[PDB]
Amino acid sequence: KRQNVRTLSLIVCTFTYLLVGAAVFDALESDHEMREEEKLKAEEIRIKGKYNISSEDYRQLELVILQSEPHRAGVQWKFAGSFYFAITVITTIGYGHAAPGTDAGKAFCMFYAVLGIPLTLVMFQSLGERMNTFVRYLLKRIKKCCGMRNTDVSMENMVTVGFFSCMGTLCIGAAAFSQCEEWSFFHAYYYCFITLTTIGFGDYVALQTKGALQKKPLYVAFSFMYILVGLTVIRAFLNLVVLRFLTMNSEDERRDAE
Amino acid sequence: KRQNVRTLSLIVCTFTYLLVGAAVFDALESDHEMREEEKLKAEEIRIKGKYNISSEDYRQLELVILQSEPHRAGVQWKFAGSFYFAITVITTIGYGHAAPGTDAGKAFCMFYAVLGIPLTLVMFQSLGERMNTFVRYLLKRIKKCCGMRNTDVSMENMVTVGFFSCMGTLCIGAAAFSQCEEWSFFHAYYYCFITLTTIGFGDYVALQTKGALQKKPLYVAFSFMYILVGLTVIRAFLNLVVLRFLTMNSEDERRDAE
Ligand SMILES: CC(C)CCC[C@@H](C)[C@H]1CC[C@H]2[C@@H]3CC=C4C[C@@H](OC(=O)CCC(=O)O)CC[C@]4(C)[C@H]3CC[C@]12C
Ligand SMILES: CC(C)CCC[C@@H](C)[C@H]1CC[C@H]2[C@@H]3CC=C4C[C@@H](OC(=O)CCC(=O)O)CC[C@]4(C)[C@H]3CC[C@]12C
Ligand SMILES: CC(C)CCC[C@@H](C)[C@H]1CC[C@H]2[C@@H]3CC=C4C[C@@H](OC(=O)CCC(=O)O)CC[C@]4(C)[C@H]3CC[C@]12C
Ligand SMILES: CC(C)CCC[C@@H](C)[C@H]1CC[C@H]2[C@@H]3CC=C4C[C@@H](OC(=O)CCC(=O)O)CC[C@]4(C)[C@H]3CC[C@]12C
Ligand SMILES: CC(C)CCC[C@@H](C)[C@H]1CC[C@H]2[C@@H]3CC=C4C[C@@H](OC(=O)CCC(=O)O)CC[C@]4(C)[C@H]3CC[C@]12C
Ligand SMILES: CC(C)CCC[C@@H](C)[C@H]1CC[C@H]2[C@@H]3CC=C4C[C@@H](OC(=O)CCC(=O)O)CC[C@]4(C)[C@H]3CC[C@]12C
Ligand SMILES: [K+]
Ligand SMILES: [K+]
Ligand SMILES: [K+]
């Protein structure tokens, strides 16, 4: 039974959390959307009237301008941008700054992700375990060197070091990207958070503001290795925190054989 | 040691898989991109020359048309669209069809995701365990009713039923969305795959082709419950397959105390 009371509690929690989220996002964003849509509609009418642009030409121009936006960021599918795409696929960040235009590319993206996502999960899990083991050794050595009465490393110490490793990773990212992309520090930090949680809205995407995929190989290398290292650190902390809970239903189901 | 040979093998595998992906995506997509960019640049020059649009006006018109695209899909931040956004946040699908425009909305999106992602992972893990337990009971009852010499349910049977549950979920989604959105069956299937893996490029997004968030409450309800159920089924199968491997490094590290 207890497994069922737990799962029903988690479902009621998730739907309550969605309702609270929806109400707060509505409260924060709904007036800004309306004022922005009134401003955009006014400027649209202004320009369309100035040049007397025909409705069919304006529709075609909208289609052209929307489809041209992936191409303004330079060549996406040559090797560097194909590698950037593959990273966003198998990590499931999926910015969608470019996404495959052909049906063959779509089918390959599916078969590629089918094997790439498991491989990447097992890889980040193994690197996270190695990282946490190194941290626990290094903390034990520090505690011994500090002469503490016990060298033992408790879960609260691991959670403290995990939290400051995540904050440090996001601050280092925010500094690098706010320098390289000319974002504000807050927007670069938001970009780093949305990337390393793998949400990946793609409102902000690095390497796109110029021909940087072609022209800045060292910044491309940084962006790729920052993504892979940051995802490792964030997942290692997430696993450290939630692993006690992910296994409860199966532990109770095994004990229920008694 | 064996833990280290495993993690180094997984890193070399991941980078080889990225190189193979990048080379194949380049081979598939790079000629289509160039032919499309030549067509778009030609149509841009055509329209800009027909109306003699000034360069500054064309830049402003591009900005207007790009920022107007979220608003063409109807009101995003009223309750139904705020709920759709919150779903894409805490599941980490993150289509980015709408993303918070204010800095307050960005900060809340961060604090909201910090708690929402763990909660949702623990919820899908618990529902997946309950689902797999139900399946294993139901298969045992079927085998007993079929009069088989043993009622035991092997891992190959669970993997077979998991695979056909995932294929069935994607086919049901592809049929519903190809009917409701006027996509082809292949594009609706690609959309379902990219959604339930949580990649979420957002090239295809349901509920956006008209005022459907406001005008079609029953299709909004279907889309939300399809997302939550599909993510449950897909994660339950992924866990079933990879759980033997996710725990190897910690099992070896525990046994290494001997
Ligand atoms: C830490 C260990 C275990 C792995 C280290 C791997 C890195 C040294 C590799 C992984 C991916 C590589 C990058 C993959 C792609 C590119 C793009 C490449 O630029 C181009 O190819 C230009 C575009 C073109 O001509 O197609 C320059 C090298 C670079 C940055 C590579 C630099 C070296 C990187 C970062
Ligand atoms: C979800 C379905 C459709 C696909 C599931 C694929 C996984 C089950 C595969 C994909 C990549 C595989 C991994 C790729 C490489 C390795 C390293 C390999 O390491 C060694 O053999 C090192 C020597 C040793 O450990 O003794 C062990 C298996 C493992 C973890 C594999 C285990 C099985 C994985 C996770
Ligand atoms: C504080 C310590 C303990 C950890 C963090 C160290 C940082 C200060 C380092 C780590 C990696 C470094 C980055 C590695 C690569 C690049 C790309 C580089 O890009 C260019 O030079 C652009 C031109 C080109 O790529 O050709 C600019 C510096 C930067 C961001 C570096 C800035 C300093 C960083 C963030
Ligand atoms: C299976 C059990 C455990 C949970 C079942 C939950 C569903 C019955 C709920 C969850 C989310 C609900 C939806 C959340 C939001 C909306 C939008 C709402 O439309 C509007 O509010 C219009 C826009 C506006 O006026 O703000 C209509 C109901 C609907 C589809 C809800 C229908 C009922 C749903 C699918
Ligand atoms: C990553 C950091 C920043 C945040 C980590 C948050 C998690 C540790 C929290 C978020 C939601 C929590 C869950 C919300 C609800 C429940 C149901 C609750 O169920 C009951 O109490 C039912 C009665 C019983 O089981 O006896 C058990 C704890 C649990 C799984 C919680 C465990 C801890 C969770 C996963
Ligand atoms: C094959 C069996 C074992 C499992 C799958 C059953 C399907 C045939 C059902 C399950 C849920 C159904 C869907 C639930 C809700 C809707 C929304 C509904 O939308 C409208 O009617 C639009 C107008 C409005 O919403 O007001 C159209 C039917 C549809 C897609 C249904 C089509 C048939 C579906 C996919
Ligand atoms: K996206
Ligand atoms: K994701
Ligand atoms: K995503």
Author numbering:
A (entry chain B), B (entry chain A): 2 to 259
From the study:
Here, we resolve structures for both human TASK-1 and TASK-3 by cryoEM, as well as for a recurrent TASK-3 variant (G236R) associated with KCNK9 Imprinting Syndrome (formerly referred to as Birk-Barel Syndrome). Overall, our results provide further insight into the structure of both TASK-1 and TASK-3 channels and demonstrate that the X-gating mechanism is a highly conserved structural gating motif within the TASK channel family that, like many other K+ channels, also exhibits a degree of allosteric coupling between the lower gate and the filter gate.
KIS is primarily characterized by LoF mutations in the maternal copy of the gene, with the majority of patients possessing a single G236R mutation. However, the most frequent mutation associated with this disorder is G236R on the M4 helix that results in significantly reduced channel activity. In addition, these two arginine residues are in relatively close proximity to each other within the inner cavity and we observed small changes in the local environment of the X-gate. The positively charged lining of the pore in the recurrent disease-causing G236R TASK-3 mutant also provides a clear structural explanation for the loss of function phenotype associated with this mutation in KCNK9 Imprinting Syndrome, and when combined with more structural information for WT TASK-3 now provides a robust structural framework for the development of activators against TASK-3 and other disease-associated mutations.
